[PDB]
Amino acid sequence: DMSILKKMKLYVEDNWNKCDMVAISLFVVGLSCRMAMSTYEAGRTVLALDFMVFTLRLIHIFAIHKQLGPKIIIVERMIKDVFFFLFFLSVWLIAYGVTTQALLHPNDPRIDWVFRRALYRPYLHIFGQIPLEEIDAAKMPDDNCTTDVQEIILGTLPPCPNIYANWLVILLLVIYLLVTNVLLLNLLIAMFSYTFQVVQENADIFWKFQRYNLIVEYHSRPALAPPFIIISHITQALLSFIKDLLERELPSGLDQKLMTWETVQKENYLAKLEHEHRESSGERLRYTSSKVQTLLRMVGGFKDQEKRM
Amino acid sequence: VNIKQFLTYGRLQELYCSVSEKNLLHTLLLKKNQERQAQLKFRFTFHEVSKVLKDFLDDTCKGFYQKLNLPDMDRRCEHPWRDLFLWAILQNRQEMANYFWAMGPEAVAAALVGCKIMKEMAHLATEAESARSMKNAKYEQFAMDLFSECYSNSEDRAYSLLVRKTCCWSKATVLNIATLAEAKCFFAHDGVQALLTKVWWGAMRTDTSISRLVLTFFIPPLVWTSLIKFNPESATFIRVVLRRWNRFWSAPVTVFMGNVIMYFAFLILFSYVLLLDFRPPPPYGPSAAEIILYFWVFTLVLEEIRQSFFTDEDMSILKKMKLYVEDNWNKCDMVAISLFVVGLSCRMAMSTYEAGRTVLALDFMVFTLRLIHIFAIHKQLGPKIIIVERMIKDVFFFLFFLSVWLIAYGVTTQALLHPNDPRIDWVFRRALYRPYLHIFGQIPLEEIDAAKMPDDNCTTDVQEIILGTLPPCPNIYANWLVILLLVIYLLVTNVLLLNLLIAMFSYTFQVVQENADIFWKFQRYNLIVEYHSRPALAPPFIIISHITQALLSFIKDLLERELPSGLDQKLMTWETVQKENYLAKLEHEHRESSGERLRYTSSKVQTLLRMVGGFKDQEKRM
Numbered sequence: 034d035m036s037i038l039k040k041m042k043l044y045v046e047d048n049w050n051k052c053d054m055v056a057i058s059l060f061v062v063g064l065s066c067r068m069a070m071s072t073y074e075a076g077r078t079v080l081a082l083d084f085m086v087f088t089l090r091l092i093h094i095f096a097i098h099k100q101l102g103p104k105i106i107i108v109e110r111m112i113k114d115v116f117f118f119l120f121f122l123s124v125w126l127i128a129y130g131v132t133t134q135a136l137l138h139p140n141d142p143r144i145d146w147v148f149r150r151a152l153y154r155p156y157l158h159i160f161g162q163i164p165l166e167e168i169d170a171a172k173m174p175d176d177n178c179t180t181d182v183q184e185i186i187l188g189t190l191p192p193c194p195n196i197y198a199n200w201l202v203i204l205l206l207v208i209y210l211l212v213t214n215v216l217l218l219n220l221l222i223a224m225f226s227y228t229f230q231v232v233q234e235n236a237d238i239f240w241k242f243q244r245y246n247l248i249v250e251y252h253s254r255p256a257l258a259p260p261f262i263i264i265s266h267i268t269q270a271l272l273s274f275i276k277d278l279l280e281r282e283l284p285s286g287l288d289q290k291l292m293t294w295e296t297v298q299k300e301n302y303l304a305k306l307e308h309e310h311r312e313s314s315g316e317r318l319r320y321t322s323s324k325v326q327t328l329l330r331m332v333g334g335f336k337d338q339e340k341r342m
Numbered sequence: 343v344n345i346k347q348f349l350t351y352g353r354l355q356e357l358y359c360s361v362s363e364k365n366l367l368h369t370l371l372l373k374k375n376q377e378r379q380a381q382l383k384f385r386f387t388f389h390e391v392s393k394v395l396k397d398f399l400d401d402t403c404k405g406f407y408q409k410l411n412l413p414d415m416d417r418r419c420e421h422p423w424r425d426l427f428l429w430a431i432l433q434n435r436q437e438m439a440n441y442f443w444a445m446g447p448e449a450v451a452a453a454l455v456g457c458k459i460m461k462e463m464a465h466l467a468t469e470a471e472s473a474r475s476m477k478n479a480k481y482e483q484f485a486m487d488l489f490s491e492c493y494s495n496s497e498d499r500a501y502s503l504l505v506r507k508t509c510c511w512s513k514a515t516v517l518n519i520a521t522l523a524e525a526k527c528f529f530a531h532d533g534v535q536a537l538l539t540k541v542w543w544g545a546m547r548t549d550t551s552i553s554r555l556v557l558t559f560f561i562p563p564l565v566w567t568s569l570i571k572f573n574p575e576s577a578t579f580i581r582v583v584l585r586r587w588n589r590f591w592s593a594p595v596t597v598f599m600g601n602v603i604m605y606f607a608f609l610i611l612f613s614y615v616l617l618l619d620f621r622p623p624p625p626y627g628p629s630a631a632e633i634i635l636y637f638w639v640f641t642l643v644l645e646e647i648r649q650s651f652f653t654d655e656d657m658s659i660l661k662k663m664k665l666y667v668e669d670n671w672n673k674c675d676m677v678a679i680s681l682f683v684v685g686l687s688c689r690m691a692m693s694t695y696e697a698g699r700t701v702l703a704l705d706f707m708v709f710t711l712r713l714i715h716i717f718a719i720h721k722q723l724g725p726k727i728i729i730v731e732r733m734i735k736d737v738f739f740f741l742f743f744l745s746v747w748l749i750a751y752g753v754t755t756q757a758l759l760h761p762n763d764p765r766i767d768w769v770f771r772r773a774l775y776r777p778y779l780h781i782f783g784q785i786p787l788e789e790i791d792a793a794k795m796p797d798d799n800c801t802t803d804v805q806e807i808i809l810g811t812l813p814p815c816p817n818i819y820a821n822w823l824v825i826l827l828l829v830i831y832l833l834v835t836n837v838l839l840l841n842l843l844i845a846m847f848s849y850t851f852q853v854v855q856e857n858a859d860i861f862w863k864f865q866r867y868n869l870i871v872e873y874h875s876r877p878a879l880a881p882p883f884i885i886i887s888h889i890t891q892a893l894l895s896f897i898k899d900l901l902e903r904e905l906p907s908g909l910d911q912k913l914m915t916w917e918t919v920q921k922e923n924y925l926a927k928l929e930h931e932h933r934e935s936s937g938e939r940l941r942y943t944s945s946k947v948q949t950l951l952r953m954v955g956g957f958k959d960q961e962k963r964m
C-alpha cells in the first residue's frame with residue numbers, strides 16, 4: 034500500500050536510480066539503433082557507453098561491503114572538493130589557453146582547432162603532455178606549413194604558428210605549468226586530506242545506517258541471481274495468482290513481558306543517571322557549600338547562646 | 343555619587359590633564375599639544391583629545407567636545423558614561439573601562455569603539471607588557487556576547503539595533519563601527535550573518551533554492567508564478583506586477599548572478615574578437631564586434647569608477663585614490679585597463695599591430711583572472727579564495743628552494759655539456775628552461791645522455807655555431823658526471839621539494855581554514871554593502887542606469903537606517919535591559935563555579951573552626 038506517484042518520486046530521488054534509468058534508456062536506444070542499418074554505428078557507440086554505465090553500477094552493488102562502503106561514502110564527499118578544484122582549474126585554463134591560442138595561431142579560422150589548442154592541449158598539460166614542438170620556436174619542426182587562410186581551411190597543409198613574441202608564450206607556459214601542476218594539485222591534495230580526516234567518522238555511521246536498509250532489501254530478494262531470477266519471478270507471480278526475521282509480531286504474554294522489562298531497564302537507567310548526578314563533584318561542592326552556610330549560621334547562634342551562659 | 347551631576351566638562355578636562363605621564367596617552371597628548379603650539383591653566387585642552395580621537399577613529403568623535411569652541415566648563419556632560427569609557431580606554435585601563443561600559447547606554451557600539459582603539463594603540467605601545475594587554479582587550483568579545491544575548495531575546499529588535507544610527511557616536515551604525523574596528527569575529531556572529539543573508543535575498547525568501555532562482559532568471563516570465571516564494575510586505579494590477587518585477591530584479595543576489603552571466607558573455611565576446619574577428623588596422627577597419635567590446639569595457643570602467651569614487655559624498659579625493667590603490671585586485675583592474683588602452687592604441691596603428699594584438703591577448707588573461715574576484719562573494723568559493731591567497735606564501739618558499747637548486751644544477755650542466763656555446767639565449771635556455779621543465783616530466787635525454795644522443799649533423803666550430811648553420815655538438819668528456827647530476831637533481835626536485843610543498847600546503851590548510859571562514863564573512867559584509875547601491879542593470883546595459891542616475895542628480899537603505907525617537911529610546915532601553923541580564927548571568931555563573939564554591943567553603947570552614955573552638959572552650963569552662 035503506497036501511492037504510485039509517491040513510489041515513482043521515491044525511486045527517482047536516489048542518484049543511483051537515476052544512473053540505472055540512464056543505463057536502461059541507453060540500452061533501449063542502442064538496441065533500437067542496432068536493429069537498423071543506417072544507425073548501426075550509433076547503436077554500437079551507445080552500447081559502448083552503456084557498458085561503462087553498468088560497470089559504474091558495480092560500485093553501488095558493492096556498497097554493502099564492510100570494508101568498501103565507507104570508502105564509497107568518502108568519495109561521494111570528496112566530489113565537492115573535486116568541484117572546487119574544477120572551478121579554479123577551469124578559470125585558469127580558459128585564461129591561459131585562449132591567450133596562447135591568440136598569441137600563437139591568430140589566423141586559424143577553424144573553430145574545432147581553436148577549441149583544441151585553447152582547451153584540450155592546456156588540459157593535457159596537467160598530465161605531463163607538454164608538446165613543445167608547437168609552442169617553442171627553437172623546438173618547432175621544419176615541416177611544410179602555409180600562412181594562407183584558404184589553404185589552412187582546406188587542410189592541405191598545417192597552419193604555421195606565429196613566432197612574433199614567443200618569449201611571452203614560453204613565459205606564459207612556464208607560469209601556467211607552475212600554477213596548475215603545483216599550486217592547484219597540491220592544494221587539492223591538502224583539501225582531500227582535511228576532508229578525509231573530518232568526514233571518515235561520520236562516513237562510518239552513515240555506512241551502518243545504509244547497511245540496515247540494504248539488509249532489509251536483501252531480506253525479500255529472491256535467492257536466485259540473474260538471469261536465473263526469472264524462475265523466481267514466475268514462481269512468485271504464480272503463487273500470488275493462486276494465493277520475516279525482522280519486524281515480527283509477538284504473543285500478548287511475551288509482548289507484555291518485554292514491555293515490563295523495558296520499563297524496568299528504563300527505571301534502572303534513570304536511577305543510574307540520577308545517582309551519577311548526586312555523586313558528581315559539582316553537586317557535592319554545592320551541597321557542601323550550602324550545608325556549610327547553614328552550619329555556620331546555626332553554630333553562630335549556638336555560640337551566642339553559649340556566650341550568654 | 344551621581345555621575346550625571348558629578349561629571350562636568352571642566353571635571354572631564356581635569357581628569358584628562360591628570361594622566362599618569364608614563365603611559366601612551368600622555369605621549370600622544372604631548373605630541374598633539376606640541377603640534378598645536380607650533381601651529382599657533384590646563385596642561386591639555388579638549389583640542390588635543392579631539393585630535394587623538396581623530397587619529398584613532400577619524401569619523402566618530404566629531405563634535406564630541408568641539409560642539410558648543412569648547413563647551414561651558416561648568417556644564418555637565420550630555421553622555422557622561424560615554425566620555426568616561428572613552429577616557430578610561432585611551433589609557434589602557436581595562437577594568438575601569440569595563441565598569442564604565444557596563445553602565446553606558448549603547449554597549450555594542452561602545453565595545454566596538456573600545457576594541458578599535460585598543461588595536462590601534464597596540465601598534466603604538468612601547469612596553470611589551472602593555473602591548474600584550476592591549477592585544478587581549480577582548481572588547482569585541484563583550485560585543486559578541488551582548489549581541490548574542492540580544493539576538494536570543496528578540497531576533498527582530500537585534501536587526502534594528504544593528505542597523506540603527508546610534509546617538510552617542512555621531513549617527514554611526516553599529517555595523518559601520520564594526521567595519522571601522524575591523525571586528526572580524528563580530529561579523530562572524532550568526533545574527534549578523536543572518537541579517538546579511540536577509541539583505542542578500544532581498545524580498546525573496548532566504549530558503550529559495552539556487553536552481554529555482556537561476557531558472558527564473560533565465561526565463562523572466564516565471565517571476566509572476568509561485569516558483570519562488572516572497573516575504574510578506576487596471577492601475578492597481580499594473581502596479582502590482584511592476585512591484586513584483588522590481589522586488590525580484592532589485593535583489594542583490596539576482597544582480598550578482600546577472601553580473602556573472604554578463605561577465606561570462608564578455609569573456610566569450612573578448613575571446614571571439616581576439617581569435618576569429620581580429621581585423622587589420624583601421625585602414626581595413628576594426629570589426630564591429632571589436633567596437634562593441636570597446637564600448638563594453640568603457641561601461642565596465644564607468645561602473646568601476648562610480649563604485650570606487652562616487653559612492654561617498656564627502657571624502658578627500660587623494661584619500662579615495664589611496665584607498666582604491668590599496669587593494670591588490672584594484673591594482674589588477676588598473677593593469678587590465680592600462681593594457682586595454684595600450685593594446686587599442688597599438689592596434690590602431692599598422693607598424694604596431696602585432697604588439698597590440700599581443701597586449702590584448704594578455705588583457706584577456708587579466709580579465710579572466712578578474713573573474714575570481716567577481717566570484718569571491720560565492721558562499722562555497724570565497725573561503726577557497728582566501729585559502730589560496732594564504733597558500734601563496736608556501737608557494738614562495740618552495741620557489742626560493744627550487745630557484746637555488748635549479749640555478750646550481752642548470753649552470754653546472756650547461757658548463758659540463760656545452761662549454762663552447764657563445765649564444766646567450768641558448769645558454770639561458772639550457773641553464774634554466776630545461777631544468778625547470780624537468781620538474782613536469784620533460785626529461786629530454788637525447789641532449790644529456792651520450793648513449794641516447796642522436797647521430798645528427800653537429801659542428802664544433804664557434805663561428806658556425808653562432809650562425810646557426812648546424813646545432814652545436816654536446817661535450818661528452820665526463821658524461822657520467824652529467825647523468826649522476828641529473829639523477830640527483832631529479833631526486834631532490836621531483837621528490838623532496840614537491841612532497842615538502844604538499845606537506846606545507848596540508849599544514850597551512852589545517853591551520854588557516856577556520857580563520858579563512860571568518861575573514862570570508864567579514865568580507866561578505868562589505869560586498870553586500872557594495873551590492874546595495876549597485877544599479878540592477880549588468881554591463882554593458884549599465885550605461886542606461888548611469889545616464890538615469892546622472893540625469894536624476896542634475897535634476898534633483900535597508901542597512902544603516904534612522905528610527906523615530908520613541909522607537910530609538912525603546913531599543914536603547916531594551917539593549918540596556920539585555921546588557922543587565924547578560925551581566926547578571928555572568929555573575930551568577932561566577933558564583934556557582936567550582937573554584938568560587940571551594941574558596942567560599944574554605945573561608946567559611948576557617949571561620950567556623952575558630953568560632954566553634956571558642957565555643958568549645960566556653961563549654962569546657964562549664
Ligand SMILES: C[C@@H]1CC[C@@]2(OC1)O[C@H]1C[C@H]3[C@@H]4CC=C5C[C@@H](OCC[C@H](CO)CO[C@@H]6O[C@H](CO)[C@@H](O[C@H]7O[C@H](CO)[C@@H](O)[C@H](O)[C@H]7O)[C@H](O)[C@H]6O)CC[C@]5(C)[C@H]4CC[C@]3(C)[C@H]1[C@@H]2C
Pocket residue numbers: 170171172173174175196199200203204207744745748749767768770771774775778810
Ligand atoms: C628558475 C626559473 C625557471 C623559469 C624561468 O625563470 C627562472 O626560467 C627563465 C629562462 C627564460 C628563457 C630563457 C631564454 C629564452 C630565449 C629567448 O629567445 C632569444 C631571442 C631569439 C630571437 O627570436 C630567439 O632565439 C632563436 O629562435 C629561433 C626561432 O626562430 C631558433 O631557430 C631555430 O630554428 C629551427 C627550429 O625549428 C632550427 O634551425 C633550430 O632549432 C633553431 O635554429 C634559434 O635557435 C634561437 O636562437 C626568448 C625567451 C626565453 C625562452 C626565456 C623565457 C623566460 C624564461 C623561461 C625564464 C623563466 C621565468
Ligand SMILES: C[C@@H]1CC[C@@]2(OC1)O[C@H]1C[C@H]3[C@@H]4CC=C5C[C@@H](OCC[C@H](CO)CO[C@@H]6O[C@H](CO)[C@@H](O[C@H]7O[C@H](CO)[C@@H](O)[C@H](O)[C@H]7O)[C@H](O)[C@H]6O)CC[C@]5(C)[C@H]4CC[C@]3(C)[C@H]1[C@@H]2C
Pocket residue numbers: 792793794795796797818821822825826829
Ligand atoms: C638505485 C640508484 C639509482 C640511481 C643510481 O644509483 C642507484 O643508478 C646508478 C647507475 C649509474 C650509471 C650506470 C652506467 C653508466 C654508464 C657509464 O658509461 C660507461 C663508460 C663508457 C665510455 O665513455 C660510455 O659508454 C658508451 O658511451 C658511448 C657514448 O659515446 C655510447 O655510444 C653510443 O653512440 C651512439 C649514441 O648516439 C650509438 O651508436 C649508440 O647509442 C652507442 O654506441 C656507448 O653505447 C656506451 O657503451 C657512465 C656512468 C653511468 C651513466 C652511471 C652513472 C651513475 C648511475 C646513474 C647511478 C645512480 C647514482
Ligand SMILES: C[C@@H]1CC[C@@]2(OC1)O[C@H]1C[C@H]3[C@@H]4CC=C5C[C@@H](O)CC[C@]5(C)[C@H]4CC[C@]3(C)[C@H]1[C@@H]2C
Pocket residue numbers: 144145148
Ligand atoms: C566542457 C565544455 C562543454 C561545451 C564546450 O566547451 C567545453 O565544448 C566545446 C566543444 C566545441 C565544438 C567542437 C567541435 C566543433 C566542430 C566544428 O566544425 C564547429 C564547432 C564545434 C561544433 C565546436 C563548437 C563549440 C563547442 C561545442 C565547445 C563548447 C563551448
Ligand SMILES: C[C@@H]1CC[C@@]2(OC1)O[C@H]1C[C@H]3[C@@H]4CC=C5C[C@@H](O)CC[C@]5(C)[C@H]4CC[C@]3(C)[C@H]1[C@@H]2C
Pocket residue numbers: 766767770
Ligand atoms: C626569472 C628571471 C627573469 C630575468 C631573467 O632571468 C630569469 O630572464 C632571463 C631571460 C634572458 C634573455 C633571454 C634572451 C636573450 C636574447 C639574446 O640574444 C641576448 C640575451 C637575452 C636578452 C637574455 C638576457 C638575460 C635574460 C633577460 C635573463 C634574466 C636574468
Ligand SMILES: *[C@@H]1O[C@H](CO)[C@@H](O)[C@H](O)[C@H]1NC(C)=O
Pocket residue numbers: 175176177
Ligand atoms: C613543401 O612543398 C613544396 C611544394 O613544391 C615542395 O617543393 C617541398 O619539397 C615541400 N617540403 C617538404 C619539407 O615537404
Ligand SMILES: *[C@@H]1O[C@H](CO)[C@@H](O)[C@H](O)[C@H]1NC(C)=O
Pocket residue numbers: 797798799
Ligand atoms: C652532414 O653534412 C655533410 C656535408 O658534406 C654531408 O655530407 C652529410 O651527409 C651530412 N650528414 C647528415 C646526417 O646530414
